[PDB]
Design an enzyme around this catalytic site. Structure first.
Site, PDB file in Angstrom:
ATOM      1  N   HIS B  42       0.803  -1.214   0.000  1.00 42.09           N
ATOM      2  CA  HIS B  42       0.000   0.000   0.000  1.00 42.09           C
ATOM      3  C   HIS B  42       0.842   1.273   0.000  1.00 42.09           C
ATOM      4  O   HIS B  42       0.367   2.334  -0.395  1.00 42.09           O
ATOM      5  CB  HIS B  42      -0.974   0.009   1.189  1.00 42.09           C
ATOM      6  CG  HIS B  42      -0.365   0.432   2.489  1.00 42.09           C
ATOM      7  ND1 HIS B  42       0.221  -0.458   3.365  1.00 42.09           N
ATOM      8  CD2 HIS B  42      -0.294   1.645   3.082  1.00 42.09           C
ATOM      9  CE1 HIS B  42       0.621   0.192   4.443  1.00 42.09           C
ATOM     10  NE2 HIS B  42       0.322   1.467   4.301  1.00 42.09           N
ATOM     11  N   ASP B  88      -0.575  -7.240   1.754  1.00 47.93           N
ATOM     12  CA  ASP B  88       0.110  -5.957   1.837  1.00 47.93           C
ATOM     13  C   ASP B  88       1.603  -6.170   2.011  1.00 47.93           C
ATOM     14  O   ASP B  88       2.134  -6.107   3.125  1.00 47.93           O
ATOM     15  CB  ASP B  88      -0.443  -5.124   3.000  1.00 47.93           C
ATOM     16  CG  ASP B  88      -0.058  -3.655   2.892  1.00 47.93           C
ATOM     17  OD1 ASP B  88       0.544  -3.265   1.861  1.00 47.93           O
ATOM     18  OD2 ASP B  88      -0.365  -2.881   3.825  1.00 47.93           O
ATOM     19  N   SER B 185       3.814   2.794   8.359  1.00 44.33           N
ATOM     20  CA  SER B 185       3.434   1.800   7.361  1.00 44.33           C
ATOM     21  C   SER B 185       4.648   1.253   6.628  1.00 44.33           C
ATOM     22  O   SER B 185       5.564   1.998   6.281  1.00 44.33           O
ATOM     23  CB  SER B 185       2.466   2.410   6.344  1.00 44.33           C
ATOM     24  OG  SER B 185       1.248   2.764   6.960  1.00 44.33           O
ATOM     25  N   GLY B 186       4.648  -0.055   6.399  1.00 43.23           N
ATOM     26  CA  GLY B 186       5.748  -0.684   5.692  1.00 43.23           C
ATOM     27  C   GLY B 186       6.988  -0.858   6.540  1.00 43.23           C
ATOM     28  O   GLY B 186       7.995  -1.395   6.078  1.00 43.23           O
TER      29      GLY B 186
HETATM   30  C1  LIG Z   1      -3.866   9.078  12.064  1.00 37.18           C
HETATM   31  O1  LIG Z   1      -3.958   7.645  12.049  1.00 37.18           O
HETATM   32  C2  LIG Z   1      -5.067   7.041  11.430  1.00 37.18           C
HETATM   33  C3  LIG Z   1      -6.417   7.641  11.324  1.00 37.18           C
HETATM   34  C4  LIG Z   1      -7.522   6.947  10.636  1.00 37.18           C
HETATM   35  C5  LIG Z   1      -7.277   5.636  10.012  1.00 37.18           C
HETATM   36  C6  LIG Z   1      -8.288   4.989   9.215  1.00 37.18           C
HETATM   37  O2  LIG Z   1      -9.075   5.636   8.523  1.00 37.18           O
HETATM   38  N1  LIG Z   1      -8.293   3.630   9.286  1.00 37.18           N
HETATM   39  C7  LIG Z   1      -9.234   3.030   8.347  1.00 37.18           C
HETATM   40  C8  LIG Z   1      -8.496   2.253   7.259  1.00 37.18           C
HETATM   41  C9  LIG Z   1      -7.900   0.970   7.827  1.00 37.18           C
HETATM   42  C10 LIG Z   1      -7.255   0.076   6.770  1.00 37.18           C
HETATM   43  N2  LIG Z   1      -8.248  -0.206   5.692  1.00 37.18           N
HETATM   44  C11 LIG Z   1      -8.732  -1.483   5.375  1.00 37.18           C
HETATM   45  C12 LIG Z   1      -9.906  -1.617   4.498  1.00 37.18           C
HETATM   46  C13 LIG Z   1     -10.464  -2.921   4.262  1.00 37.18           C
HETATM   47  N3  LIG Z   1      -9.851  -4.009   4.878  1.00 37.18           N
HETATM   48  C14 LIG Z   1      -8.724  -3.973   5.696  1.00 37.18           C
HETATM   49  C15 LIG Z   1      -8.123  -2.683   5.964  1.00 37.18           C
HETATM   50  C16 LIG Z   1      -8.795   1.021   5.059  1.00 37.18           C
HETATM   51  C17 LIG Z   1      -9.464   1.844   6.147  1.00 37.18           C
HETATM   52  C18 LIG Z   1      -5.959   5.016  10.126  1.00 37.18           C
HETATM   53  C19 LIG Z   1      -4.868   5.705  10.845  1.00 37.18           C
HETATM   54  O3  LIG Z   1      -3.621   5.172  11.009  1.00 37.18           O
HETATM   55  C20 LIG Z   1      -3.486   3.778  11.216  1.00 37.18           C
HETATM   56  C21 LIG Z   1      -2.056   3.712  11.692  1.00 37.18           C
HETATM   57  C22 LIG Z   1      -1.602   2.324  11.996  1.00 37.18           C
HETATM   58  C23 LIG Z   1      -1.624   1.817  13.372  1.00 37.18           C
HETATM   59  C24 LIG Z   1      -1.074   0.495  13.707  1.00 37.18           C
HETATM   60  C25 LIG Z   1      -0.533  -0.349  12.635  1.00 37.18           C
HETATM   61 CL1  LIG Z   1       0.118  -1.876  12.949  1.00 37.18          CL
HETATM   62  C26 LIG Z   1      -0.534   0.137  11.267  1.00 37.18           C
HETATM   63  C27 LIG Z   1      -1.048   1.463  10.963  1.00 37.18           C
HETATM   64 CL2  LIG Z   1      -0.916   1.974   9.372  1.00 37.18          CL
END
Ligand SMILES: COc1ccc(C(=O)NCC2CCN(c3ccncc3)CC2)cc1OCCc1ccc(Cl)cc1Cl
Ligand SMILES: [Ca+2]
Lengths: 53, 234
Positions: B42, B88, B185-186
């Protein structure tokens, strides 16, 4: 907790049972020691080791 | 990284940063070898062109350790979908080999079975990155690390508003304010064994940062070891 289930078979790294018996192995960058268990690094910056001074 | 501590000199030598044409970091990565970087699929949609920096712990200075490398090849997993965030994962081939030194070394790749029976059965693992320190704050200029408890697969699915596929896994806390955040991420998810760190996951996604009742969603590395080998062999 028998073979590799018992303290990782006393292996430094990878452990697997080949015929009810422990067989150790190492990640890329290391070489199995003569004792068959330890992993000797092959260079100055082996994978997975923190670099401290 | 929300909470956690900062990576001290040489504690997270396998951390890699993806930087855009503007020189800012948007995603993390893991050093697998002199020519290879492990990252999140991603992350490849967040920039047209990007380079990779290694040996950096502070994004606003020159510890002389830093080093920028251009991506030769970008191997992305064809089955990756935004709709589901499944698969991913991506590998990067650099035009020039990384020079290992203080703060710059690779994380080991484990054997699938052993990893699955001895690494992921451990109590914790370590996630690292330059991501946000708070859900709403801004990017961090210091590389950080965070011990994230392995989470029961069952509990994981229950807490997720999304379907957790077999290629992912939860790490973190249910209520404690520590977790990864955007910009991580990543990045690396490594598990320690007898003073050796193995790549066990890829910071994939989460519903916010450290939100109560939610966990961090990582890419299950053991599920792509063969894919990784193949990706490096060529
Ligand atoms: C400021 O931070 C955030 C605010 C809103 C969302 C937000 O909006 N989340 C909704 C997303 C979630 C992933 N998605 C999907 C969709 C369908 N299936 C699986 C995942 C798309 C919507 C995600 C955020 O960051 C996630 C950060 C994060 C935390 C822990 C780990 Cl281990 C990795 C990461 Cl990158
Ligand atoms: Ca610096």
């Amino acid at each position: 907790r028998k073979l590799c289930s018992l303290d990782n078979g006393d292996c430094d790294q990878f452990c697997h049972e080949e015929q009810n018996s422990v067989v150790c192995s190492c990640a890329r960058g290391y070489t199995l020691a003569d004792n068959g268990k330890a992993c000797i690094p092959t260079g100055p910056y082996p994978c997975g080791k923190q670099t401290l001074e | 990284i929300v909470g956690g501590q900062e990576c001290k000199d040489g504690e997270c030598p396998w951390q890699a940063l993806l930087i855009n044409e503007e020189n800012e970091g948007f995603c993390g990565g893991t050093i697998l070898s002199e020519f290879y970087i492990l990252t999140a699929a991603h992350c490849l949609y967040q920039a047209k062109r990007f380079k990779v920096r290694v040996g950096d712990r502070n994004t606003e200075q020159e510890e002389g350790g830093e080093a920028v490398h251009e991506v030769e090849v970008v191997i992305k997993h064809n089955r990756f979908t935004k709709e589901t965030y499944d698969f991913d994962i991506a590998v990067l081939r650099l035009k020039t080999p990384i020079t290992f030194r203080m703060n710059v070394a690779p994380a080991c790749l484990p054997e699938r079975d052993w990893a699955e029976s001895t690494l992921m059965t451990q109590k914790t693992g370590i996630v690292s990155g330059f991501g946000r320190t708070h859900e709403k704050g801004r990017q961090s200029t210091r590389l950080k690390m965070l011990e994230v408890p392995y989470v029961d697969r069952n509990s994981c699915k229950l807490s997720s508003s999304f379907i957790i596929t077999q290629n992912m896994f939860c790490a973190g806390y249910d209520t404690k304010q520590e977790d990864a955040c955007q910009g991580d991420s990543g990045g690396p998810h490594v598990t320690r064994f007898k003073d050796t760190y193995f790549v066990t996951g890829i910071v994939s996604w989460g519903e916010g940062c450290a939100r109560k009742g939610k966990y961090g969603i990582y890419t299950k590395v053991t599920a792509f070891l063969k894919w990784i080998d193949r990706s490096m062999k060529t």
